[PDB]
Design a binder for this molecule. Structure first.
Ligand SMILES: Nc1ncnc2c1ncn2[C@@H]1O[C@H](COP(=O)(O)OP(=O)(O)O)[C@@H](O)[C@H]1O
Ligand SMILES: [Mg+2]
Lengths: 57, 587, 10, 174, 467
């Protein structure tokens, strides 16, 4: 019965291949929407919220 | 201006500055969310506020708006069959408005539904008549159980009815009465607000003389309460203080129930909202949901500690309002020790000197003032009506110790003490009432009632108390020296007391035959048990062997024990067959 | 506790 | 009994190997997503540096940052740490900053603005200022790097909606 | 959307005005509009960053409790930055299958959580009108719980144990075997918070989640006994905000256990003593019922969401004293308690659950016609009656001997031996169905004659007493 250790040793490199589909999808989504995300990030960073505290009157 | 500023925040206590010209116990809106709080102390321009919401996020400098009014409760139609948030705002409407499973901070919702049209019908007063506070100037049909909700003038209002509305359907905001006093005209709708911290006036305080017939044999027979009395139920954390409270709310004589959950589970206020509609009362002549006459004041433990105090005021004020309509209300306050902990938590964060166990020195005064609101009274104004407010306060002693400050104070104040025993609750002996220490000071007055309905009741009660005390003292001996070293009389006493405990005092509150036990059934069972004891004592007194007689009369004992199982449904004189099928089948 | 409160915060 | 226990141990070893492989795959997906987000933020940092290097386009931003920090401090006198690149640019705009703080705070104009001789580390800071109380105790780090660092945490749930859209299981939002 | 408001930069004030450090507490002196309950970041002279919670504000003064401890903090070079918000945890369904600090930082070598939201760890009390009363019984597999202390899905029932007792094994068995008696048509998600536990306790729980494949469904929040003490005041709220997000936000039936909730009480007393507040019993804070109820009551079901939180806090009673403040106030807040007993444990029994101090507040409604079985309540009550009488027969035999205890006492001694050694005794990984456990209860009540089973009504005594 000890032979199943090799069987589990082979389980890696199988799901490591199945997950590459989702990894590629992540990369594609990044390449698509990264420009927009960066645009909003920049406009938020340089946009000033120059207002005093509410309680400062 | 009306705007002070938050100076300090610590737990539920907010100290605000620029609060000069602020009155004690005045409501205030704290912060930008407009959290409701009450000015508890004034020191110069600094006002200390107990916030009734979560203070997380409150900033120093946040506005504090005076409202000019005390913590008030709205009183009028639409009050039964409803559950409220410690303060007087409604939880169902809150859920419907916020469309969420939480209670938003600072949400404002009118306490009474202002869109329901109520069928007002004017009373006996006409234009030009003089009206004063408490005068029933009309009635509305609220529900099939509360078929005539009296419309009373506010207690502190007066004048000559300049105008009275005709019979018809009016919302709560529609004007119903105009009354001129000193040339000034005042307008009265179907509801009015009353300060929850001021007791509602009465013409005179009567003497409570009618029993508060719960469904429990031990509480009805051994330690009775009256309508208008004060009782406390100290106990540990699983001995049934909340099951007793709910059974009383279900089967008590009270025309209305104010169930206050001051710092309790939110699944125990949910079960009341689930079972009371499914439970019905034929006190109106037809089965009407007990919920139709039972309102709720849900303020769980996860909910602000400072609203555990506004939960107890709201409940007693509602009971006083309904007593002012001629009703015999029962306020069930589960728990009074959570309101005392809230005052211990406010006092500790407030700086003044703590007492014996951190409680304020004025805890006893607060409890006394709360319990002094209960009683039988003639209601202010005409028609002449009489009402009563009973208070059933569950105390939760820290560790089950009855020497606690809250428990000692309540025992000093209350007239009935239904002390619960944890050991009995573990055996599932329910109700787990400690007969050794529990007392009822209303047994003397109830004499009259018994002399009018059950003359043997006081004597039988005293006999059963004596038997139980003897058996308590004797079981201790038997636990060490054995039962065979006792006299036959002592063994009879032990057997009788065991039978009483396991069949008379023990009452399954979640069954059909023992969910409720009417007083006639209690009296019949008491007579049966005492007669069995007398028969055994006589049989052994004139010469007999109790050891064999127990086997000989085993079936008579079985019948006495099974008297418990009679269904009360076959009311009165069908169960009363036990008068012969039990007291003549033997004895 | 009482002594601390009285003699430090009063 | 020993044989049964040891076979149970073998089965549990098999199951644990399967579970560990699955967990490492899940963490691989999560780390890929995190690295994509980090790349987005790195590009944003490069763009912020570029904008900060454009003096004419950078001057209004720098004034707005200084005025915002001063409005948060609400101190009569302030100190401004800035890149040695911007000390000259800030010196030419002190009057504008003072007047703008006075008007936006509906308060008397700022009494005094020091420009600290301790310049921000140009290697790490690409723009903006650090505005400090007169005592140098209380400060606000209104730098482009710090602003982006704060946004990288405040805006994370919005970036996840932008990139990967709504989640199928979140049924109740709040 | 609501997430769109996150695209906003809010600069933070960095103060450097620390004026005192005593125990957990740091006092900071010249705050501008201090905010109650706000979270702050203390940068130490060493440069490490710690987090703290503003416990009190007074003018310009703020009192902050530092979760990671105040060691190494000085008044000169320590700066404190005020974030302006309370403590919010990032929450995604990708939290399931992950391990975090008591502060919510990943310790599985994975990345931070890609948040779908930042949810305040204090939550909000559920509207009592929005609550559903739990009535779906969970077969824990343990006869001492299923047959006499039956747990409903959505119930909050801790395990009152003590030290040297197998309360971790009992909780692991419950999590391992838990399921509905009548399945609706799925496995629980699990949220495990550990406060001040050993390393081998955490290892036991983690590897038993490994073994049963429930770790992919599990988020762990491990504050071990070598981690900061004050960080234990946030661990159970970060774990109950993650459990809540799965329970209502993702509609996931979840079972969330707050192991060593009793340890959290020690941290609450440490903070309270540092604040010199007026104490309760044994020095514990006078507000410990309100602090333990803001954790215990974050369980249950709600009307329109098909998810629940079943909470099993684990609580070790000092000196096995149930009147101690911690177990006492838990009993007054929770809907029952499974009482792990040292007398039964020394006596060789597992699970050493003493059913007499134990209770399930939601059992009455979870058992009966059509949903477990008709004899379940009567059988349970009769078993309690006979066990309470067998334990008093065994005390009378210890001082007096068998020769002077009645026949019923002998029957109760026999009942007590078989109850504890055959019914309450049960191997680990032995899953008994509520029906097998009722059949075994009927076999033990047959020891007695039909006439002394006086806590069973004649209808039930008729159908089951003779099978
Ligand atoms: N009269 C009774 N009949 C049956 N069970 C009862 C009775 N009284 C109490 N119990 C049981 O005791 C449990 C705990 O008591 P509870 O009502 O919560 O009171 P407390 O608040 O004092 O703990 C209840 O959930 C119920 O199972
Ligand atoms: Mg209670």
């Amino acid at each position: 019965e000890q032979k199943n250790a090799g069987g589990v040793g082979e389980l890696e490199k199988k799901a490591e291949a199945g997950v590459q589909g989702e990894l590629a999808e992540i990369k594609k989504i990044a390449e698509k929407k990264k420009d927009d995300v960066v645009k909003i990030l920049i406009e938020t960073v340089i946009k000033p919220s120059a207002e005093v505290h509410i309680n400062a009157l | 201006s009306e705007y002070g500023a938050i100076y300090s925040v610590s737990g539920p206590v907010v100290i605000a500055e620029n609060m000069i010209g602020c009155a004690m116990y005045e409501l205030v809106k704290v912060g930008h969310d407009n959290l409701v709080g009450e000015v508890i102390r004034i020191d110069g321009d600094k006002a200390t506020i107990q916030v009734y919401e979560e203070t997380a996020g409150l900033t120093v400098g946040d506005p504090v708006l005076r409202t000019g009014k005390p913590l008030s409760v709205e009183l009028g139609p639409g009050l039964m069959e409803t559950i409220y948030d410690g303060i007087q705002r409604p939880l169902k409407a809150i859920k419907e408005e916020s469309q969420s499973i939480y209670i938003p901070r600072g949400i404002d919702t009118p306490a009474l539904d202002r869109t329901i049209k109520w069928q007002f019908t004017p009373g006996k007063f006409q234009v030009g008549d003089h009206i004063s506070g408490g005068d029933i100037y009309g009635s509305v049909f609220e529900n099939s159980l509360i078929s005539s909700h009296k419309i009373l003038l506010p207690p502190r209002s007066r004048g000559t009815i300049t105008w009275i509305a005709p019979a018809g359907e009016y919302t709560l905001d529609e004007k119903i009465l105009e009354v001129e006093f000193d040339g000034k005209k005042s307008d009265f709708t179907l509801y009015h607000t009353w300060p929850v911290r001021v007791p509602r006036p009465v013409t005179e305080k009567l003497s409570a003389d009618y029993p508060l017939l719960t469904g429990q044999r031990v509480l009805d027979a051994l330690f009775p309460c009256v309508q208008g009395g004060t009782t406390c139920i100290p106990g540990a954390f699983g001995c049934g203080k909340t099951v007793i409270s709910q059974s009383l709310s279900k089967y008590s004589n009270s025309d209305a129930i104010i169930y206050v959950g001051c710092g309790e589970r939110g699944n125990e206020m949910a079960e009341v909202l689930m079972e009371f509609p499914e439970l019905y009362t034929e006190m109106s002549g037809t089965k009407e949901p007990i919920m139709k006459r039972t309102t709720l004041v849900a303020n769980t433990s996860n909910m602000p500690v400072a609203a555990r105090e506004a939960s107890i005021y709201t409940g007693i004020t509602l009971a006083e309002y309904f007593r002012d309509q001629g009703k015999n209300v029962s306020m069930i306050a589960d728990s009074s020790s959570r309101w005392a902990e809230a005052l211990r938590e406010i006092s500790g964060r407030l700086g003044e000197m703590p007492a014996d166990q951190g409680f304020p020195a004025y805890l006893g005064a607060k409890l006394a003032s709360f319990y002094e609101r209960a009683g039988k009274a003639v209601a202010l104004g005409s028609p002449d009506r009489t009402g009563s407010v009973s208070i059933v306060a569950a105390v939760s002693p820290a560790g089950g110790d009855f020497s606690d400050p809250v428990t000692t104070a309540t025992l000093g104040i209350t007239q009935v003490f239904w002390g619960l025993d944890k050991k009995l609750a573990q055996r599932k002996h329910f109700p787990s009432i400690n007969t050794s220490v529990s007392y009822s000071k209303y047994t003397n007055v109830l004499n009259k009632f018994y002399d009018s309905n059950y003359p043997e009741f006081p004597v039988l009660r005293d006999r059963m108390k004596e038997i139980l005390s003897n058996a308590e003292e004797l079981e201790q001996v038997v636990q060490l020296v054995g039962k065979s070293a006792l006299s036959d009389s002592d063994k009879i006493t032990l057997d009788v007391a065991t039978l009483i405990k396991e069949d008379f005092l023990q009452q399954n509150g979640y069954s059909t035959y023992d969910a409720f036990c009417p007083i006639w059934k209690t009296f019949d069972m008491m007579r049966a048990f005492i007669s069995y004891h007398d028969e055994a004592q006589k049989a052994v007194a004139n010469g007999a062997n109790w050891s064999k007689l127990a086997d000989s009369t085993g079936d008579v004992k079985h019948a006495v024990s099974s008297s418990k199982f009679f269904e009360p449904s076959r009311g009165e004189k069908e169960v009363h067959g036990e008068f012969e099928k039990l007291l003549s089948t033997m004895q | 506790v009482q002594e601390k409160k009285q003699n430090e915060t009063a | 009994g020993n044989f049964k226990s040891k076979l149970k141990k073998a089965m549990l070893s098999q199951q644990i190997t399967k579970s560990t492989i699955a967990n490492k795959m899940r963490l691989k997906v999560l780390s890929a997503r995190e690295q994509s987000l980090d790349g987005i933020f790195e590009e944003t940092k490069e763009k912020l540096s570029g904008i900060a290097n454009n003096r004419d386009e950078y001057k209004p931003i720098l004034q707005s940052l200084i005025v915002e920090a001063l409005l948060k401090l609400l101190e009569p006198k302030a100190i401004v740490k800035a890149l040695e690149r911007d000390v000259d640019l800030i010196e030419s705009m002190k009057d504008d900053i003072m007047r703008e703080y006075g008007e936006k705070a509906q308060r008397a104009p700022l009494e005094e603005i020091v420009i600290s001789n301790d310049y921000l580390n140009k290697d790490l800071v690409s723009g903006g200022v650090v505005v400090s109380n007169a005592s140098d105790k209380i400060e606000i780090n209104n730098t482009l790097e710090e602003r982006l660092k704060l946004l990288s945490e405040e805006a994370l749930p919005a970036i996840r909606l932008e990139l990967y859209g709504p989640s199928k299981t979140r049924k109740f939002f709040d | 959307k609501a997430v769109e408001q996150g695209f906003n930069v809010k600069p933070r004030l960095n103060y450097n005005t620390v004026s005192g450090v005593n125990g957990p507490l740091v006092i900071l002196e010249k705050v501008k509009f201090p905010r109650y309950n706000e979270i702050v970041n203390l940068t130490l002279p060493d440069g490490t960053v710690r987090q703290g919670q503003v416990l009190e504000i007074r003018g310009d003064r703020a009192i902050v409790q530092v979760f990671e401890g105040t060691s190494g903090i000085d008044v000169k070079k320590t700066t404190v930055e005020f974030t302006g918000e309370s403590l919010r945890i990032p929450v995604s369904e990708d939290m399931l299958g992950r391990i975090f600090d008591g502060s919510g930082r990943p310790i599985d070598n994975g990345p931070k959580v890609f948040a779908e939201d930042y949810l305040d760890i204090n939550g909000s009390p559920i509207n009592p009108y929005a609550r559903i009363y739990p009535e779906e019984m969970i077969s824990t597999g343990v006869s001492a719980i299923d047959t006499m202390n039956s747990i409903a899905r959505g119930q909050k029932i801790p395990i009152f144990s003590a030290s040297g007792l197998p309360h971790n094994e009992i909780a692991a068995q419950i999590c391992r075997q838990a399921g509905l008696v009548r399945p609706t048509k799925e496995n629980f998600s699990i949220v495990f918070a550990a406060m001040g536990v050993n390393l081998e306790t955490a290892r036991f729980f983690k590897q038993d989640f490994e073994e049963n494949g429930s770790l992919e469904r599990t988020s762990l929040f491990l504050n071990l006994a070598n981690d900061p003490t004050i960080e234990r005041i946030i661990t159970p709220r970060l774990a109950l905000t993650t459990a809540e997000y799965l329970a209502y936000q993702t509609e996931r039936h979840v079972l969330t256990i707050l192991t060593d909730m009793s340890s959290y009480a020690d941290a609450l007393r440490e903070v309270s003593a540092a604040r010199e507040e007026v104490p309760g019993r044994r020095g514990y804070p006078g507000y410990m019922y309100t602090d333990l109820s803001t954790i215990y009551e974050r369980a249950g079901r709600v009307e329109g969401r098909n998810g629940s939180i079943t909470q099993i806090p684990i609580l070790t009673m000092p000196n096995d004293d149930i009147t101690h403040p911690i177990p006492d106030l838990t009993g007054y807040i929770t809907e029952g308690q499974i009482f792990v007993d040292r007398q039964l444990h020394n006596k060789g029994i597992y699970p050493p659950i003493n059913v007499l101090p134990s209770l399930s507040r939601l059992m009455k409604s979870a058992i009966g016609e059509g949903m477990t079985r008709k004899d379940h309540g009567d059988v349970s009550n009769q078993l309690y009656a006979k066990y309470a009488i067998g334990k008093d027969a065994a005390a009378m035999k210890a001082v007096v001997g068998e020769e002077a205890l009645s026949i019923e006492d002998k029957l109760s001694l026999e009942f007590l031996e078989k109850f504890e050694k055959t019914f309450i005794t049960q191997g680990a990984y032995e899953d008994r169905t509520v029906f097998e456990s009722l059949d075994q209860a009927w076999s033990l009540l047959r020891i007695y004659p039909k006439e002394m089973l006086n806590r069973i009504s004649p209808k039930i005594l008729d159908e089951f007493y003779d099978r």
